[PDB]
Amino acid sequence: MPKRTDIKSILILGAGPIVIGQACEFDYSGAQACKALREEGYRVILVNSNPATIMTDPEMADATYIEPIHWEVVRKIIEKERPDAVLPTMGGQTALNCALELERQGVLEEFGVTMIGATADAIDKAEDRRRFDVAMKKIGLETARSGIAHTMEEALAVAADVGFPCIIRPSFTMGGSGGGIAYNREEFEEICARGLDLSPTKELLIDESLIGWKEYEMEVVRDKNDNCIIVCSIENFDAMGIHTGDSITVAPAQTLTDKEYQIMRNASMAVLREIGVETGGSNVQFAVNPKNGRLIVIEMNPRVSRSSALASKATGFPIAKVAAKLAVGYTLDELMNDITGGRTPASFEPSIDYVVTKIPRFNFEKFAGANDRLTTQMKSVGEVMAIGRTQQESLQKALRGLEVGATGFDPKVSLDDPEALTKIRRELKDAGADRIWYIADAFRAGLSVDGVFNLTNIDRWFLVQIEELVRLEEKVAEVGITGLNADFLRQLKRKGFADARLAKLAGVREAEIRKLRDQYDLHPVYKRVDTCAAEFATDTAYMYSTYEEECEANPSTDREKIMVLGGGPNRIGQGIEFDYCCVHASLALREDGYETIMVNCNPETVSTDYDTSDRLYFEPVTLEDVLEIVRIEKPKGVIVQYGGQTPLKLARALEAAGVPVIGTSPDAIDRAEDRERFQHAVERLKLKQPANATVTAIEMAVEKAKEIGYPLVVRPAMEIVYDEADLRRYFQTAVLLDHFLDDAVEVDVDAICDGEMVLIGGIMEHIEQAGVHSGDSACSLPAYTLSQEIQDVMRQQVQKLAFELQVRGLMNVQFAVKNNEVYLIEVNPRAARTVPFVSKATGVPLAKVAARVMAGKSLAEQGVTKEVIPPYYSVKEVVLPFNKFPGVDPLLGPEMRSTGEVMGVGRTFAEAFAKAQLGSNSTMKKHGRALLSVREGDKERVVDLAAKLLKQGFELDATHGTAIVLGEAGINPRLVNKVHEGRPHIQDRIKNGEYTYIINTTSGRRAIEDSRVIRRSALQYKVHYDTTLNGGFATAMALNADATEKVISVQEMHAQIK
Amino acid sequence: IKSALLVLEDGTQFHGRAIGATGSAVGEVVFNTSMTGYQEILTDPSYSRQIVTLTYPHIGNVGTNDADEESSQVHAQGLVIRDLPLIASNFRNTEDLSSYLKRHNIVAIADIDTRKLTRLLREKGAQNGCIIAGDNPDAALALEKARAFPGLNGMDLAKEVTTAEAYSWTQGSWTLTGGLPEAKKEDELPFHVVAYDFGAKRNILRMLVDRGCRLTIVPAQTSAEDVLKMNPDGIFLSNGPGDPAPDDYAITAIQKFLETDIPVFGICLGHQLLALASGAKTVKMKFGHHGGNHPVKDVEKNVVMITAQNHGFAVDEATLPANLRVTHKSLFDGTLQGIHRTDKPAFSFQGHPEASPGPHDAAPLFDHFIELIEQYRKT
């Protein structure tokens, strides 16, 4: 049937802030969904607390809500928008969770909201692990031997039955959240206690081990006519026991005979039919015993996911757009296939003539106390994808596109290290983020494919391939650059070797290999993605490079082209925010008439959606790869300022090679990035900067340190040293030296320079003081405590800096305010991660404006010349991944660790902040008992905070010194023992639920290591805690507001702007 | 360095590596999109005289095995692939693809831009080609052989593949657990189907057995008369290479079965036969349908099935006699896929309901057949 008529308005549940296991893929999907439904003339209403999403762009939907994704808030939204239907399968687990709670709370009933795409029962059928196990048995599909548990005692009994190691999987969770592999009872109780508490339904499934079996996934789509298709099959490179999301995976499957594939295909379908998914897609997971083909069903996810996004990129079949259309009565046969020019229908199974590879991206270096072995709970922060004509080609391209500095299989251990085999061994047997390199090392060190197999359980089909590449590398190394004849090189390029890796082996510069290629006329050709293995033509330009004969790029001679370079995989600090900018550059320029060409390889993003640009090169963002594109595209300009560090870092070399970089110059960029260069300009401008020094030696430092004055910011991993004694200490464990600006307000300012005038995009005042990374700070726009006079001072320094640095497009400047004095922290001459937030807040699409600027259209010409100061407050707050790494001290500091952010909109700062806090998933309560344990320098201001809490009705506890100060001011908290002091102590109290709120501030490395237990416990037991007094106050203010009281749309917000 | 070369009528040359027999092969070149199932494909008689190109780069990942053979031998003239994996990795593997090609004496080339090739064929249609694998392949020779090629167009291929003597089949379908089962005992199958071997895929037989048939395989040229004499519960027209001439013997015989009330069912070639024999017209297709992801709509129930295709000729829908009703159409190109005799208990399907390889979506076509069969015996 055609579109549903009994439906007019639809509410789409967004995924919320980015976290490990629930990332950008939902922005990609939510956007596709918005696009699809608006295309079909529906009235779209959506909710997403994450402001850095293309999905919340005002022009994307009818009624956009950037509000905390809480059932009571959504309730207000429903109540206010009266949606006919609700689509809950495009927002990750957050969306499924909310839909069912809404359901549970009777809200859907109350406003007569019909659930589409998937039903409430279908969702539960899939999400409730016991129910899922029961459905499988009903359809004769086999599942691992397992047991349900609702308590630790129950749990222990199942373990008794399945033995160790056993797998623990919570109901109503994904990304492995709350689960793990228990090798022992001690491990067992820990994960169990963790999952029971995390499970929305407080339930676990405990299974016998299948660690080592092959792992597979299938992406399915089903329509109301019962039509059913397999969109893509995926074979995991890493075996069962390492979560799909933390695994290297490829498409399509590689080691299954047709017979086995059909059986898996059939089951897949059977699974959707049984769960009840009738109008949409789903991911079905399996385990296969390589020894006998024995098939086991693991799970099914009744929604779009990270694999669906990868599958959509992999094949060119837009799963979510299609599914959104299915949720409204269309059938597959009625829809056309996008990339095949609409010539063929959406009812068919794709066929691909290439190999797709996905490699997850980790950030273990940012979490030192964390367990870094790969398991069933995801730990990756992002992923990269690559396409090649062969698996080798595909694999190596992904490696060089991973952004971890590899150029392919770079060595991890020395050939001559006597202990090398033991290290390798361990890395193979117990996988970490570096396993892939270690496999190559293994082969260099003499272990056999069977030895590797035995330790890794990685199918030999893959292993042999890596081995052959190592063997090739050895020859390169033997013959050197002289043996790099054309036949040979060509061979090498065909296997995906990078010019950079070859250079290393031959001991020459990368540019030498590149030059070599030019001589030989050895360049790649471009193939197009088309979903049908070339069986039909395509009018879409979605391409990847490969070393073959025929090229399908067919660039235009026609228009002026503009190239936008993506950021590659997302990582902490290099998130979706830069992607958003990228997307906007392309949307604005395109609209303006340019031919837009995107270069990116992040499968999760809107940037790699073929609809976002005129041309898409799904390639590693590297010098080699970009040059090749420029080579044949001959663009008018290239933008390197919107994708984060990745492209920024190629700026000079691109220019050096003749690329037409537009906007702020590579040199300009360096002036600001280079400390020295930067320090001179400040000087030249007569601006204030913190005293600093560049020390070489320890003793040098101590002296110079005396010069600068403690505390000190030691930027080589950053540290805050407080005293001489502190200095050495660091040194041991251990160079810029800067005076740390204590008790200062940190500010961010985003702006645009066109050479003619400067546009202040936004002045953001951080809640957390300077010393807590801006990326991990909550912030307000407009400033909530900074004087207009002081703000005026910053605006001026920004203008002076802009002109002086020669900015052209976006810029970001960070200041510190101490004693009514402005200090410069840094200048980032490109798009910053606050950009999207500023855009949403103020209604000005800074990224679009600045791209226009970069392309030639001045600020005056566009009509964007005056700074917007909205009539409401906007507060951004972050989300931290500490919960994924329990051994890490969940404390803020000068290094960035958050993964995502949310935005709160309010009539007052207090309201904004309360919305942001809630949306951040805070467990804060308006009542109870608060714990106060503060550092010396906070002891003074804590009194006021203690009073405010008292005024709210909280009871108080305090540690010794804090109690003393409180006592003197007239406040007598109940005293609590420090762990070492006796019983009961904090830990006991926290573990017993005595507190609903904790304020614990600490200064000084040792005192930090000492107080570790408070923060760790606080997190483990879900109690809201603040680690800064500033944050404490903000929280206090919020107690006076009610986040659920009022909601407003983005369109509405924008409308109040004068 | 073991060279191999492929040359198209058009003169387009593909240089790569030999991975099969030494020598040459000439044939119509076609492309198959099947990501899995290369063994079953290679062993399909329908491929007789054809040079097979697979779109999926890595061919041979799982080796080979006897169970995965659709016929008694390799029917493909040659094999064109992009990459031959270093190893075969699958519990079912009994011999690596290269060795198998050798054993069967197949000329095969790897390492060529199959995508280029594919696009050429799609765009400019099917072409004859020649592969040459050896020490110093001669391109002009190759070119020469290509050009010289008579081609399929006006060739009786089925006669070439059909069985010399008639025989009995009573073996059913493979199972992961049991594998290929022991042939059943005549007295174990209810029905008795007579199957015309126009170069029949073994899975077709197996899946008929599965439904309770006991078969009797017969040569292509067998007379309706001789047939009738057996007292068949059902008459089955197998798949096979090329297309029948309105001229030939089977037509004639088919016509005679259609005068009777016996149930008739054809697959692929079988389908074309039924259509000709009914007064329909067949056409050669630009490049045809070869792959396993083909959407086919049952117009009668408005439902879609993903199927296994392998055909170069098709039944012209516009020239269909009024006694032939359209039952299915391709969702890719709208070409005719299924037909049923308004007046008789006869029907056919262009695709391969037996898959092998391929999706199982169309298996039910068999069922209608049994129905028919059962109702015929009722009378």
Ligand SMILES: Nc1ncnc2c1ncn2[C@@H]1O[C@H](COP(=O)(O)OP(=O)(O)O)[C@@H](O)[C@H]1O
């Ligand atoms: N019985 C098992 N033995 C070993 N590994 C398993 C087993 N069951 C699942 N796994 C592993 O745990 C991962 C997470 O399980 P899954 O059911 O997919 O949970 P989630 O819904 O959180 O993704 C799987 O991708 C797989 O690697």
Ligand SMILES: Nc1ncnc2c1ncn2[C@@H]1O[C@H](COP(=O)(O)OP(=O)(O)O)[C@@H](O)[C@H]1O
């Ligand atoms: N001299 C300083 N005084 C106080 N805080 C500072 C100082 N230098 C840096 N910081 C803190 O360190 C964080 C990171 O410093 P920054 O130089 O901006 O590094 P990055 O390149 O990571 O942005 C800042 O956001 C701020 O909280």
Ligand SMILES: O=c1ccn([C@@H]2O[C@H](COP(=O)(O)O)[C@@H](O)[C@H]2O)c(=O)[nH]1
């Ligand atoms: O076992 C503990 C508990 C707390 N603290 C730290 O001491 C301060 C509070 O203790 P007091 O000053 O109230 O005595 C905080 O900075 C807290 O981090 C410790 O060093 N050790």
Ligand SMILES: CC[N+](CC)(CC)CC
């Ligand atoms: C994975 C996202 N959450 C579960 C739905 C945990 C932070 C949202 C609260």
Ligand SMILES: NCCC[C@H](N)C(=O)O
């Ligand atoms: N804006 C950062 C999050 C604050 C966290 N509650 C902490 O105080 O550590």
Ligand SMILES: [Cl-]
């Ligand atoms: Cl909720």
Ligand SMILES: [Cl-]
């Ligand atoms: Cl979750």
Ligand SMILES: [Cl-]
């Ligand atoms: Cl087993």
Ligand SMILES: [Cl-]
């Ligand atoms: Cl060589």
Ligand SMILES: [Cl-]
């Ligand atoms: Cl940890």
Ligand SMILES: [K+]
């Ligand atoms: K079971």
Ligand SMILES: [K+]
């Ligand atoms: K895995």
Ligand SMILES: [K+]
């Ligand atoms: K699930």
Ligand SMILES: [K+]
């Ligand atoms: K800060």
Ligand SMILES: [K+]
């Ligand atoms: K070649």
Ligand SMILES: [Mn+2]
């Ligand atoms: Mn899941």
